[PDB]
Amino acid sequence: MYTFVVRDENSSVYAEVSRLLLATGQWKRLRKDNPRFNLMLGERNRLPFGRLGHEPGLVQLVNYYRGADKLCRKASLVKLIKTSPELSESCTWFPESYHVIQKYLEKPLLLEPGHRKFDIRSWVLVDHLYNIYLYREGVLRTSGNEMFFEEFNQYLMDALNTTLENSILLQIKHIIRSCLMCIEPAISTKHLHYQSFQLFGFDFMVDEELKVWLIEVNGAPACAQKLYAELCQGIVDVAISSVFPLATSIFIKLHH
Amino acid sequence: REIVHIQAGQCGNQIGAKFWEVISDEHGIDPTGSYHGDSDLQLERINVYYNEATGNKYVPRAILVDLEPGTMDSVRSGPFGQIFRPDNFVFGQSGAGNNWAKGHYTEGAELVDSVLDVVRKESESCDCLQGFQLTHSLGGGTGSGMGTLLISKIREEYPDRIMNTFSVMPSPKVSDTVVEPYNATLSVHQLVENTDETYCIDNEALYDICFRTLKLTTPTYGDLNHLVSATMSGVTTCLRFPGQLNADLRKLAVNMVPFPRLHFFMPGFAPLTSRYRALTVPELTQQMFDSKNMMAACDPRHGRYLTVAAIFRGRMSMKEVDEQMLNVQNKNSSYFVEWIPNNVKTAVCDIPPRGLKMSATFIGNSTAIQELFKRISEQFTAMFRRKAFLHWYTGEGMDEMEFTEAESNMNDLVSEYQQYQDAT
Amino acid sequence: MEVIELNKCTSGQSFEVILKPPSRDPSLEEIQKKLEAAEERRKYQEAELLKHLAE
Amino acid sequence: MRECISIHVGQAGVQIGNACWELYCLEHGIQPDGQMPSDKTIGGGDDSFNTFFSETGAGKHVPRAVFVDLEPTVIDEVRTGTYRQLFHPEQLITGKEDAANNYARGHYTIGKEIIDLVLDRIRKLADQCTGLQGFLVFHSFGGGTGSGFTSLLMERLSVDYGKKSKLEFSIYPAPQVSTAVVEPYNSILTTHTTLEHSDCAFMVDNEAIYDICRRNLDIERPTYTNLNRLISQIVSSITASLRFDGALNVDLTEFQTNLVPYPRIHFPLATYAPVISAEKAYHEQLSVAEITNACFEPANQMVKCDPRHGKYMACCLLYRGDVVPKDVNAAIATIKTKRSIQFVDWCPTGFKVGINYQPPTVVPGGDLAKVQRAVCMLSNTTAIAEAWARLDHKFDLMYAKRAFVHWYVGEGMEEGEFSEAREDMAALEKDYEEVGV
Numbered sequence A: 001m002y003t004f005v006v007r008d009e010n011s012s013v014y015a016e017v018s019r020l021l022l023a024t025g026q027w028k029r030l031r032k033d034n035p036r037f038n039l040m041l042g043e044r045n046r047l048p049f050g051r052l053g054h055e056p057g058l059v060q061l062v063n064y065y066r067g068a069d070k071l072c073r074k075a076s077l078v079k080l081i082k083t084s085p086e087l088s089e090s091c092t093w094f095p096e097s098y099h100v101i102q103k104y105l106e107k108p109l110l111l112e113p114g115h116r117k118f119d120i121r122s123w124v125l126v127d128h129l130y131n132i133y134l135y136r137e138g139v140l141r142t143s144g145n146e147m148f149f150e151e152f153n154q155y156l157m158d159a160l161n162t163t164l165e166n167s168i169l170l171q172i173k174h175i176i177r178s179c180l181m182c183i184e185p186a187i188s189t190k191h192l193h194y195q196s197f198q199l200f201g202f203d204f205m206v207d208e209e210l211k212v213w214l215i216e217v218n219g220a221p222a223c224a225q226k227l228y229a230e231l232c233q234g235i236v237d238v239a240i241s242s243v244f245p246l247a248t249s250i251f252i253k254l255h256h
Numbered sequence B: 001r002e003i004v005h006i007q008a009g010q011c012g013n014q015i016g017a018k019f020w021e022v023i024s025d026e027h028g029i030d031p032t033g034s035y036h037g038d039s040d041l042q043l044e045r046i047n048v049y050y051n052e053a054t055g056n057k058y059v060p061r062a063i064l065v066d067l068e069p070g071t072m073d074s075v076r077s078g079p080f081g082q083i084f085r086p087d088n089f090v091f092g093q094s095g096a097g098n099n100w101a102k103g104h105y106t107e108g109a110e111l112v113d114s115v116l117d118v119v120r121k122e123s124e125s126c127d128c129l130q131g132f133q134l135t136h137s138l139g140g141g142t143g144s145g146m147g148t149l150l151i152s153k154i155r156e157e158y159p160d161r162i163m164n165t166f167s168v169m170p171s172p173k174v175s176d177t178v179v180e181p182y183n184a185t186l187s188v189h190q191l192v193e194n195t196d197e198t199y200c201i202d203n204e205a206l207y208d209i210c211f212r213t214l215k216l217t218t219p220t221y222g223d224l225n226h227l228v229s230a231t232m233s234g235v236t237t238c239l240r241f242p243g244q245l246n247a248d249l250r251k252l253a254v255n256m257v258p259f260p261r262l263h264f265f266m267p268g269f270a271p272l273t274s275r276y277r278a279l280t281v282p283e284l285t286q287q288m289f290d291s292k293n294m295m296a297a298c299d300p301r302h303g304r305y306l307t308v309a310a311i312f313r314g315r316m317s318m319k320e321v322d323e324q325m326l327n328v329q330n331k332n333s334s335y336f337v338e339w340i341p342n343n344v345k346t347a348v349c350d351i352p353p354r355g356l357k358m359s360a361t362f363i364g365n366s367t368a369i370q371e372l373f374k375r376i377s378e379q380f381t382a383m384f385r386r387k388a389f390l391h392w393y394t395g396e397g398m399d400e401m402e403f404t405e406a407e408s409n410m411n412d413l414v415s416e417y418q419q420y421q422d423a424t
Numbered sequence C: 001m002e003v004i005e006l007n008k009c010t011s012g013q014s015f016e017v018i019l020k021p022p023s024r025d026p027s028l029e030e031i032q033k034k035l036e037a038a039e040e041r042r043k044y045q046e047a048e049l050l051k052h053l054a055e
Numbered sequence D: 001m002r003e004c005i006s007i008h009v010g011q012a013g014v015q016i017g018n019a020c021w022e023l024y025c026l027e028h029g030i031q032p033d034g035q036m037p038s039d040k041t042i043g044g045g046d047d048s049f050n051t052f053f054s055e056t057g058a059g060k061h062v063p064r065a066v067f068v069d070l071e072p073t074v075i076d077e078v079r080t081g082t083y084r085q086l087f088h089p090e091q092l093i094t095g096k097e098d099a100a101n102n103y104a105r106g107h108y109t110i111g112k113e114i115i116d117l118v119l120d121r122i123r124k125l126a127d128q129c130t131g132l133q134g135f136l137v138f139h140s141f142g143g144g145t146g147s148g149f150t151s152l153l154m155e156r157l158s159v160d161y162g163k164k165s166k167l168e169f170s171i172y173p174a175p176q177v178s179t180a181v182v183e184p185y186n187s188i189l190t191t192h193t194t195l196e197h198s199d200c201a202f203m204v205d206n207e208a209i210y211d212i213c214r215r216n217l218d219i220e221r222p223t224y225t226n227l228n229r230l231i232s233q234i235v236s237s238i239t240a241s242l243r244f245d246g247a248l249n250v251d252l253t254e255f256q257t258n259l260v261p262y263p264r265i266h267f268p269l270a271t272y273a274p275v276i277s278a279e280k281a282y283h284e285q286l287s288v289a290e291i292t293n294a295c296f297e298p299a300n301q302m303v304k305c306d307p308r309h310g311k312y313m314a315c316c317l318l319y320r321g322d323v324v325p326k327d328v329n330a331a332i333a334t335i336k337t338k339r340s341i342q343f344v345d346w347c348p349t350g351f352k353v354g355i356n357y358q359p360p361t362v363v364p365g366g367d368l369a370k371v372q373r374a375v376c377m378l379s380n381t382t383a384i385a386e387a388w389a390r391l392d393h394k395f396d397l398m399y400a401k402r403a404f405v406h407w408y409v410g411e412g413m414e415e416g417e418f419s420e421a422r423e424d425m426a427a428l429e430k431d432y433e434e435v436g437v
């Protein structure tokens, strides 16, 4: 059996991951302070990266990337965009910024009927080998109160004569690829003594010309209830069992 | 760094005598005392337990003690009985009658100063004395009562040296008298205070191992001692042979004993054998931790290991040894305390014990050892509540309060072993 | 990248490279004091032992 | 010639001392009988190798070293080994019973009996020094002698030689090779006691060196002989500046002014490359760019940690072999673009470089292949504070239950010295954090 610990009980995502892992009959959960674990589902604040990868005979994997804070706190994110040569002036997709002060989108795309404003959240997963996996299911937080990609796509076809892939998704795959390639040297664990994966939540907004802008990145996202079951199994399949194998593809591999 | 061995009583002299036979074969020493071994590894650290003599013969640094002459004469009539220094036989004629008080207070007091004089002569010869090693039983009179007396008086003369005992616990399955719980509770009070490390060889466990594992329907004392001499050979390996770990008694005590009173170790051995296939290193490891291979009738899954020391003997891949030892800890990490990091230490020796080509010996300081002290405390109270058989002790000058003090000190020991079983 | 203070020898060279610029002794008495305060504590607890053994 | 005294304490110190002085003798052409044919100055000289070796009228070169172990078994094999003729019997000092992996036993109980003996035999060496620089001290954190007796020795060397500088090479405890369960206790105690008496301390984590021998030399179960001959390679390139003609790190004072701006933060992280197996029949000779790149990979460091999430205060690169200056400036250029190297703001971002042309020497028949160029990078990064955090966490797990404390107070120590030394380490962890954030 493989062993894991859970040190963030308030995590709705990895709670479901803990359930599925235990249901395998090949994973068993240890006490939080038990060091002899394979997989850590660690805390959000002051996660002790410095003590991982030091137990002999144990391959250790954690569900966070040390240094990902540089992309998930909006203060760090704006500093990263302006200073980074790999981005900087080339960003036509990050609103001008100096919480912190940013421009406002005068011209949002308005879903109708009802003149509705929205933002889009897609979930991205980065495994221990820094392959970038975009979850084919996203969701628009419309102003339940959630529109999914099948509806939004058919709206785009019948309202504006284009598809979700061409109008918006292309830019999204470019933005996700661009930020994560930037900090890859800073946070990769490819030749470290422990390994990292992490689930990310990218938030986008679309203006009235079908141009996508990046609002913020969240390092500990929740999912939509409809989709919890499919994404959490993919985390186990692609990020956890890839390292600890057992006895369709809901993801899109973003190439680099 | 020399060790002085002392054996007291029938059980102590019998398990002690088998111990010296076993290790004398491993070091290639014959009953005449002369050496006939192939490897100079056998002679390298032989000074720990043997004294070099004229004609380059080796004489065990052993003192044989009893209050009856019979057992000593049988050791002298034994195969290796000639090897023991004739002066190191210290005996009397009265006997102790399975009465702790006769060994500790009355009959034993006369002989004790004689034994200490033999100890002193051996000690003065020593260049650097590690400490002492005592084989005895806790349920008789001589080993239980006079043995704990000698420990008390050795500590007075040598306060800085280490006291290590192999103590055989009584069991109704292999019993001599109904007063064995009285003798055992009284002795444990002493061992708690005056020893640094005690191996709990439980006669109940030895009987069960002979019965249900080795399929011996009615075991002899020799059958049990065969298990004891194997364990005693396994746990002294790192003292007698050069290895990766060149060990002594104090370093063992420092690393195995987190709190001074919790120094009662569960021995274990694999493979269990009756008086040609060799075990693969994974088999050795699985059996060595198996409760069915413990020399104390305690379920280690009912407790948690505070510390663990394990020995492997034979020619095997040290890589596979630590892959397998790490595997058990990583697979059963619940049963090891999280507040003592890396509390399992393995050693490897190339020379296997006679007969087997691969072997594993286990020394555990597990909190499950309190099952053994509960059992002896339950038998003790059943009698003491009604003061039964107590006149055999009050007629030798003892008081009921001294029984009360031992009962409660041992019941404290059990609660202390339970404190840490639940601490986080 | 500037290179500074190159010193050559028969055995080797030494230099510096810059990419970006910037932006009570305890006495023998005291140690011997605590060294003896520990030995007095040692022999105190031994005396307590030899008196516990005398009783 | 300003001279240097080496002191080796405990088993780890004595056997690593064995590794280096054996290597030193190969690098300087000194035979196990003390004879040096390259040396035509018979009986004297102000050469740079005389900083480490004295000369007899019989032309013998003897180490300016002293070995100290409270147990004789390990120093005895130096007395009967291949380099027995090398040392005078007086500079090999042994006691009767060791410290039983107990800091307090080595510091107080057994330390007080032998402290004056070695300081006498040290001063015998210093009286033969026209201008003593200081001392190189080799020991383990976990050993009772290596922790307890060293910290007493470092205390009394500060009194008797307050002007001279003390450099420390320390073996940090690793469970894969550790012998004792209380090594975190000894480590915190000796570090606290020695902190203000050591001018510079190079830690070597046994686990780092262990997995380098597994990964790069392809040894399934490394021994101390493997680890030490690797360790000595790093030790040799660190001390190479004092034994050969150089301009970089020619005196022990330079190690401080170059690497240690903050007295307490005097623990530089060392990174060495290449480590090539001798069994590898044909090894691609790694360029200067490739072995300078490797110095920033965590897998080649002496302490497992990630410098990417700390900040540098200094950085030396010591090259041994066929290395030309503009070769390294091109390699420095390319790696600064592709790696996360944040110096602190109040320090310049750069490197001090020394090149010694003589390639690394390896032990014949050893498991290290001879390479034509190698590099050792000493870097004072705050990421080394992780190694403290790990050690302190282990200390905290045991001390909350007071496990094994009685062995220490039984030797006359006070229970408060534990929490004293522990909050010194709690202060050391925050001093690191303030610099690096």
Ligand SMILES: Nc1nc2c(ncn2[C@@H]2O[C@H](COP(=O)(O)OP(=O)(O)OP(=O)(O)O)[C@@H](O)[C@H]2O)c(=O)[nH]1
Pocket: D009, D010, D011, D012, D013, D015, D016, D069, D070, D071, D098, D099, D100, D101, D102, D106, D140, D141, D142, D143, D144, D145, D146, D147, D171, D172, D173, D174, D177, D178, D179, D180, D183, D206, D224, D227, D228, D231
């Ligand atoms: N690299 C290396 N580490 C060693 C060597 N010998 C011991 N160690 C390490 O040192 C620690 C144990 O300390 P020792 O040096 O053996 O103990 P000591 O200094 O002799 O002190 P005592 O034996 O307790 O009196 C453990 O962490 C070992 O892994 C060695 O030869 N090379």
Ligand SMILES: Nc1nc2c(ncn2[C@@H]2O[C@H](COP(=O)(O)OP(=O)(O)O)[C@@H](O)[C@H]2O)c(=O)[nH]1
Pocket: B008, B009, B010, B011, B012, B014, B015, B096, B097, B098, B099, B137, B138, B139, B140, B141, B142, B143, B144, B168, B169, B170, B171, B174, B175, B176, B180, B203, B206, B221, B222, B224, B225, B228
């Ligand atoms: N394992 C073992 N136990 C023994 C042996 N002899 C006696 N015992 C046990 O030891 C206890 C009796 O102690 P004994 O040595 O005979 O009395 P003593 O001579 O006065 O100490 C009883 O519990 C017996 O079961 C022996 O040779 N081997």
Ligand SMILES: CCNc1nc(N2CC(=O)Nc3cc(OC)ccc32)c2ncccc2n1
Pocket: B235, B236, B237, B238, B239, B245, B247, B248, B249, B251, B252, B255, B256, B307, B308, B309, B310, B311, B342, B343, B344, B345, B346, B347, D179, D180, D181
């Ligand atoms: C009496 C024989 N002596 C001896 N001593 C050992 N030691 C001493 C030591 O140096 N370290 C050590 C650390 C431990 O940690 C949990 C446990 C034990 C030890 C030892 N270990 C493993 C097998 C056999 C051993 N035999």
Ligand SMILES: [Ca+2]
Pocket: B113, B117
């Ligand atoms: Ca007398």
Ligand SMILES: [Ca+2]
Pocket: D039, D040, D041, D042, D043, D044, D045, D047, D055
């Ligand atoms: Ca000369």
Ligand SMILES: [Cl-]
Pocket: D216, D273, D274, D275, D276, D294, D300
């Ligand atoms: Cl390398």
Ligand SMILES: [Mg+2]
Pocket: B010
């Ligand atoms: Mg009898």
Ligand SMILES: [Mg+2]
Pocket: D010, D011, D071, D098, D143, D145
């Ligand atoms: Mg030692």
